[PDB]
Amino acid sequence: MLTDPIADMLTRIRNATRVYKESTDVPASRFKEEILRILAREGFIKGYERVDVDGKPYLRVYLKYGPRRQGPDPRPEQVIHHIRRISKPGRRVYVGVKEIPRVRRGLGIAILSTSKGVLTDREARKLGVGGELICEVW
Amino acid sequence: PTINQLVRKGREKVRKKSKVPALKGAPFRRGVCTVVRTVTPKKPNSALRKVAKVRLTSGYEVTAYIPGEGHNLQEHSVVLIRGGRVKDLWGVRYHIVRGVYDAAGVKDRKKSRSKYGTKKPKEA
RNA sequence: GGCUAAUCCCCCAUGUGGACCCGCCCCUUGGGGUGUGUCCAAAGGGCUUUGCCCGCUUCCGGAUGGGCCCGCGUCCCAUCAGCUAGUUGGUGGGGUAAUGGCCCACCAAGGCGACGACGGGUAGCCGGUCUGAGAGGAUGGCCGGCCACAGGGGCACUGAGACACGGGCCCCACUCCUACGGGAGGCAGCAGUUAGGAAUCUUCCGCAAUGGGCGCAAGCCUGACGGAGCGACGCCGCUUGGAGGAAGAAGCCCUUCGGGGUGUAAACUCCUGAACCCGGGACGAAACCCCCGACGAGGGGACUGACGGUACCGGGGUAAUAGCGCCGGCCAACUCCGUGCCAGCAGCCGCGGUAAUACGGAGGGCGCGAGCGUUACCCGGAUUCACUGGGCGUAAAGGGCGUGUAGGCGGCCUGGGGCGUCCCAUGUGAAAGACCACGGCUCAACCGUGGGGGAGCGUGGGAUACGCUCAGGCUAGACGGUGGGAGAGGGUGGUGGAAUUCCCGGAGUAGCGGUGAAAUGCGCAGAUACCGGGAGGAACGCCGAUGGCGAAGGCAGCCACCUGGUCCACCCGUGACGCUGAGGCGCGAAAGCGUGGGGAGCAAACCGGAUUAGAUACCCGGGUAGUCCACGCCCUAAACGAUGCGCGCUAGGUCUCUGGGUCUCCUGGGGGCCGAAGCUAACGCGUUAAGCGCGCCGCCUGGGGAGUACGGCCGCAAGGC
RNA sequence: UUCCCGGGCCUUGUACACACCGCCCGUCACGCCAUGGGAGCGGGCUCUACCCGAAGUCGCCGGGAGCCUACGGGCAGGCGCCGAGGGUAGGGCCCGUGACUGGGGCGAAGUCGUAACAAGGUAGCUGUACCGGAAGGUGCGGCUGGAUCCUUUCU
Numbered sequence A: 001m002l003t004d005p006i007a008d009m010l011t012r013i014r015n016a017t018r019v020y021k022e023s024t025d026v027p028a029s030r031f032k033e034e035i036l037r038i039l040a041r042e043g044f045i046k047g048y049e050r051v052d053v054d055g056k057p058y059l060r061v062y063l064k065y066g067p068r069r070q071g072p073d074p075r076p077e078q079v080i081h082h083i084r085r086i087s088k089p090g091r092r093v094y095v096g097v098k099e100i101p102r103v104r105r106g107l108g109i110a111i112l113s114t115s116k117g118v119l120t121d122r123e124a125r126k127l128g129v130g131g132e133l134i135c136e137v138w
Numbered sequence B: 001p002t003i004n005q006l007v008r009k010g011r012e013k014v015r016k017k018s019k020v021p022a023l024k025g026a027p028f029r030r031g032v033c034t035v036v037r038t039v040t041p042k043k044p045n046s047a048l049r050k051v052a053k054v055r056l057t058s059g060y061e062v063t064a065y066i067p068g069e070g071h072n073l074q075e076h077s078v079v080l081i082r083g084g085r086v087k088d089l090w091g092v093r094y095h096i097v098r099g100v101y102d103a104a105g106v107k108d109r110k111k112s113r114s115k116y117g118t119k120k121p122k123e124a
Numbered sequence C: 001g002g003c004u005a006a007u008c009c010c011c012c013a014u015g016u017g018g019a020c021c022c023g024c025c026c027c028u029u030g031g032g033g034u035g036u037g038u039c040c041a042a043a044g045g046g047c048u049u050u051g052c053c054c055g056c057u058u059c060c061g062g063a064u065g066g067g068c069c070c071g072c073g074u075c076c077c078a079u080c081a082g083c084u085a086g087u088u089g090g091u092g093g094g095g096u097a098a099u100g101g102c103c104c105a106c107c108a109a110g111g112c113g114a115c116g117a118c119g120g121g122u123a124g125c126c127g128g129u130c131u132g133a134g135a136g137g138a139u140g141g142c143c144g145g146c147c148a149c150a151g152g153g154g155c156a157c158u159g160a161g162a163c164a165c166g167g168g169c170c171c172c173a174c175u176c177c178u179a180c181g182g183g184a185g186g187c188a189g190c191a192g193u194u195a196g197g198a199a200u201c202u203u204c205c206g207c208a209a210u211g212g213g214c215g216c217a218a219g220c221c222u223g224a225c226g227g228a229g230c231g232a233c234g235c236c237g238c239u240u241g242g243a244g245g246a247a248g249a250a251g252c253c254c255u256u257c258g259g260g261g262u263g264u265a266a267a268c269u270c271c272u273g274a275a276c277c278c279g280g281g282a283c284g285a286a287a288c289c290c291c292c293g294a295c296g297a298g299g300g301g302a303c304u305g306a307c308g309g310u311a312c313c314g315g316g317g318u319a320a321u322a323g324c325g326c327c328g329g330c331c332a333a334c335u336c337c338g339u340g341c342c343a344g345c346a347g348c349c350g351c352g353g354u355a356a357u358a359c360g361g362a363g364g365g366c367g368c369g370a371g372c373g374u375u376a377c378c379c380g381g382a383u384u385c386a387c388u389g390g391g392c393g394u395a396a397a398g399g400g401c402g403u404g405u406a407g408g409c410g411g412c413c414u415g416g417g418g419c420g421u422c423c424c425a426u427g428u429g430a431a432a433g434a435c436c437a438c439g440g441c442u443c444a445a446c447c448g449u450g451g452g453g454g455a456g457c458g459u460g461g462g463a464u465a466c467g468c469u470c471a472g473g474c475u476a477g478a479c480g481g482u483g484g485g486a487g488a489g490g491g492u493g494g495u496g497g498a499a500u501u502c503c504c505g506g507a508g509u510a511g512c513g514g515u516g517a518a519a520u521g522c523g524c525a526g527a528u529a530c531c532g533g534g535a536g537g538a539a540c541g542c543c544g545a546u547g548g549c550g551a552a553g554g555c556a557g558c559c560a561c562c563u564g565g566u567c568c569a570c571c572c573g574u575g576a577c578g579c580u581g582a583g584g585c586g587c588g589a590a591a592g593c594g595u596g597g598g599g600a601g602c603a604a605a606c607c608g609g610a611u612u613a614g615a616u617a618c619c620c621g622g623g624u625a626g627u628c629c630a631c632g633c634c635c636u637a638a639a640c641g642a643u644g645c646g647c648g649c650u651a652g653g654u655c656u657c658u659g660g661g662u663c664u665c666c667u668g669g670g671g672g673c674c675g676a677a678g679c680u681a682a683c684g685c686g687u688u689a690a691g692c693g694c695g696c697c698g699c700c701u702g703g704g705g706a707g708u709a710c711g712g713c714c715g716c717a718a719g720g721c
Numbered sequence D: 001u002u003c004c005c006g007g008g009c010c011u012u013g014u015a016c017a018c019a020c021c022g023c024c025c026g027u028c029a030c031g032c033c034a035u036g037g038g039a040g041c042g043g044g045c046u047c048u049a050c051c052c053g054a055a056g057u058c059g060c061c062g063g064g065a066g067c068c069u070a071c072g073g074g075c076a077g078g079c080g081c082c083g084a085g086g087g088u089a090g091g092g093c094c095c096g097u098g099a100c101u102g103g104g105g106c107g108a109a110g111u112c113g114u115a116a117c118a119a120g121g122u123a124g125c126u127g128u129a130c131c132g133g134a135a136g137g138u139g140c141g142g143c144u145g146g147a148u149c150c151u152u153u154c155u
């Protein structure tokens, strides 16, 4: 059992991209699908596919990065520079609407689960709802 | 600590002990001199430092420093304890305020006169 | 003892109505209605005297103020771990405005506690305030709200209300009066005194205002209050002048003796006019009251100041207080002289032992300025208790290891609920304060008016992603089945050879042993070296590893029994059954303890021989406990990977142990070495993380004092926690 | 080229850095200081059992033993429960004082050694155990945080 599945996703992504892997698999949940879909829509991943590994469902996340660079260390600027959990089991964090973070001066996002569904901080504010603060990406 | 651990045990606020029991929380205590003597200072220096054993209104006997050049104090003179200690001296935790009670100020001192308790002289 | 009035007490009546028993009805804890029965009312006074007033009585509402009850929040110590006899409930009753063990009687045997009861310590609580970027920390003077007390302790009486600060009773301590029988007090009201203390004010003015009590009023009372006084205690406003004035006086300081500095600073010229003198002179005050009207609405009229001749306006008018800290670094400001580890400085670092920007003075300078410093204390910096926002291989810090209790945490899909979560409305969130705006004292301080915001909690409504719950599915976790393994994993029995020591015997003879060198010691009663035989105790050479097993401690000859863990394969069963774990419990090297055994070698202590200046040692010869067994204690450790457990994720290379596979090699599970990314203070770690993440436990907060003291708990003790 | 002296290069351990003529441990004696523990006394608060008990409310009596009476009852008075406080015996806390005392600081590093740091000259450290003027030595077991592959103190 993963204790936090959602984190395990976020991290799978973290390590994945930090080696510039082209794609990575995470065990599939509809919720994870949702989170992903937000990233995709926000330009953070390339997109993802539902897929099958040894007959068990995964979602395959295809990662994007910047150009190649010059000087020593040609390695590309990450597109997800930073991705982290906020709510975790065993400390659950919920913001009301007025308490919804703005992130990296607007240049980042926060993904909240709400009774209106999974939305970006901007999305949630425009919808005028709060909820469980799932993670921040930038 | 886990968060749950903090919810259980918490964090310990840490208190500081007062460098001065002039008690009362008071800024000064009055006392009487007991012994007025001289003492040699700690390892890095040498001098003869002037001190009084004082018996305070606050019930305590304490050694106090007598700052400045000259001094008039002797066995029965009553004095004011202002606190702040002397570093290169053994167990001297407070200074005597000069100018108050049987402490005279420092004769002829022209310079930082309110420390040392001397009045502004006139000029010609 | 006698007389007497009333709005004082009583009796009979009237019964709008109300109270009480009982019945019914509605409503639902004792709310409302109704019926019979019983019980219950009153007080007069004034006049502009046939009506009006101020009152009285019963009842129903209102308003205002309260009582009681509940959810939640509300300091420190667990070195306080158990507390409980009206204690916990029940019935009946007493008591009250009212619920209630509030109190009593009888009955039952309960109630509370690691979600911290009980105990100890401290403490009025709050609106707010201080600080902080915030989160947070600290605080609760003044003003407003609540509580509690009124010399200490109890108690009730009157009353709508008290268990009453200037009411009552009693006990106690104290003061005072006394004719010694007995009495009188109670400033934590305003002032004031005294004591204590570093320290906190006038025995002022006034009832004019606002407010309060009584009165139909006129009024009376009001140390509530409105004012004044003292204190640089705070805050704000303002003064000690403004303009000109030298290549720049004297004095003083420095000087390379040329000069530099204080410096336009002074002197001086002109101007303004704090102080102060004169004249005017408030607002706050219009009611109550009187008059018309109707004692109403409305209209008209009169009186009334403590602050105070104050503020303010007008006139006149004098160049009119500056001080304190500092100038080594942090920190803005440097030179001379004096002093010579002295005298002294000092917040830390540290200055002073003859060239001192660090002591002391001076010149100069920096900073604030009617202040400036100091002391104390709070927040700050301190991300140094880390929620925001720290950590634990070697810096402080992983529990010696396990088992699991509470508790924390919980894979994939579906549906219901909608508790957490989120949203809308609403109620509350007093005033003051904070904030914004306009405004009023010439400004400000201070003050007024308006506005905004807002956590929390109550109610109604809504959402359902996530968290929970219920229901129902799944198999990727977990366990199980079958099959194949490896192993010093454990307990009990047995049993095998090598060596040591001893005994017996043979043969053999002058030494052996031991050291740097020696000696002690042993040997002619025949040792050492050699052969044979017996006894006994302990430990298992080679295999053996750079190996394996185990949670740890630890575990090595062979055999049998008993028994624990574990890896792989097949993908068969269960279907989330999962991870962690305070406490508890169990285990726990060595040494040590108790009882009884055993005792070959070794060996603390000890006995000797050496060495040394000594030698309570290192070296040599002996040797007791012990080392071994059984049973019972002990609970420690460099109990070391100095690295908690579990899971998921992140290049490889190479060596190995053990499975499976089409057996260059591949695929699991362990052990090693280099190393990607990455981490790290470095050293180093790196799919056996010290990397990236989640869950949970343990622990850390400078060194010494100190693993000490005290307390408690273990233990036979030693000692442990 | 072993040894003595001086020296060069590489490497290694270090707790040295006025740098091995370096660093550094413990015991002792008598002063003086400020702490901490502390029997015995002295004061306080508290709790338990027992005995005494004001005031007051409540309960009962209230009687040819008092007052009023419309004879219904009322008052006085008495008695009892509770009860502030007091007494005796005890457990606990706190304050004061205090005999006696542990460890520390200053005298002076004074004294004896030389235990640790370099292979510290017997590698160290460690739990334990015995022993010794003292650092310490020794036994057992453990650790690496151990160098390299005669004895001979101090500065």
Ligand SMILES: [Mg+2]
Pocket: A096
């Ligand atoms: Mg909210």
Ligand SMILES: [Mg+2]
Pocket: B044, B045, B046, C341
């Ligand atoms: Mg010096």
Ligand SMILES: [Mg+2]
Pocket: B076, B077, B102
């Ligand atoms: Mg004198």
Ligand SMILES: [Mg+2]
Pocket: B084, C347
């Ligand atoms: Mg200070």
Ligand SMILES: [Mg+2]
Pocket: B112
């Ligand atoms: Mg000075």
Ligand SMILES: [Mg+2]
Pocket: none
């Ligand atoms: Mg009479």
Ligand SMILES: [Mg+2]
Pocket: C003
């Ligand atoms: Mg008469």
Ligand SMILES: [Mg+2]
Pocket: none
């Ligand atoms: Mg009647």
Ligand SMILES: [Mg+2]
Pocket: none
């Ligand atoms: Mg009627």
Ligand SMILES: [Mg+2]
Pocket: C030
């Ligand atoms: Mg009733």
Ligand SMILES: [Mg+2]
Pocket: none
């Ligand atoms: Mg009446």
Ligand SMILES: [Mg+2]
Pocket: none
């Ligand atoms: Mg009448």
Ligand SMILES: [Mg+2]
Pocket: none
């Ligand atoms: Mg009310």
Ligand SMILES: [Mg+2]
Pocket: C085
């Ligand atoms: Mg009782």
Ligand SMILES: [Mg+2]
Pocket: C091, C107
């Ligand atoms: Mg009954």
Ligand SMILES: [Mg+2]
Pocket: none
């Ligand atoms: Mg009852």
